[PDB]
Amino acid sequence: PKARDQAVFPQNGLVVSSVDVQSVEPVDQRTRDALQRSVQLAIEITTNSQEAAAKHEAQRLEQEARGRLERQKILDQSEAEKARKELLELEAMSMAV
Amino acid sequence: SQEAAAKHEAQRLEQEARGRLERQKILDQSEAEKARKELLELEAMSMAV
Amino acid sequence: PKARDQAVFPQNGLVVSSVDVQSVEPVDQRTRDALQRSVQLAIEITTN
């Protein structure tokens, strides 16, 4: 015998019931306002997604972790310079020959 | 969560613990430099030959 | 027996129901305004 906000159901050997409470003038409007605002943020992130960023920034954050190392990437260069150095002395070694 | 962050920040906190070591990551580099040094003296050793 | 914002459907052995709430003077206009604004940003990114 459900009746508006009165959900009852006395089963053959079990009793089911449920009743809830909602809305209050000041908070009702504030609740609705909240709901409509979340849509805004959604559109906002959607716009940024339409532009580009996304994967690019993902890679940024990932690499910044490596950045905290001590500019990780510069290390990659130091060894590269080493390789360049190898060639320099080689140009001299071949010139020595 | 929709933007990104998440895993990225998780890794941050985890690594910061290692950071408190004394910039853990720099140590990883010092040894790497050692390896680079090994090559330098090798370029000199091979040049010595 | 649907009746405006009163969707009910007592199946042979199941009860279906649904009712919703929408619009409030200040926020209704603000909602509509939001909807029309998203189109602007769309045109903006389109121009670029």
Residues from chain C contacting residue A33 (CB–CB below 8 Å): 27
Cα A39 to the center of its chain, rounded Å: 17
Nearest-CB residue to A40 (from C26, C27, C34) = C34
Residues on chain A touching C38 (C-beta within 8 angstroms): 43
Work out the minimum CA distance from A32 to partner chain C, whole angstroms. 8
CB-closest option in C21, C27, C41 to A36: C27
CB A66 within 8 Å of CB A72:
yes
Technique behind the model: X-ray
Q: DSSP readout, A35-90? A: HHHHHHHHHHHHHHHHHS-THHHHHHHHHHHHHTTTSHHHHHHHHHHHHHHHHHHH
With tokens 């960023």, the residue in question is: A53
Distance set, CA A74 to CA A11, A33, A35, A53, B29 (Å):
73, 50, 47, 24, 10
Q: A79 and B25 in contact by Cβ < 8 A?
A: no
Q: Which residues contact A94 (CB under 8 A, 6 or more apart)?
A: none
Give Cα separations from A21 to A1, A9, A89, B37 (angstroms): 19, 19, 83, 73
Longest pairwise C-alpha distance within chain C: 57
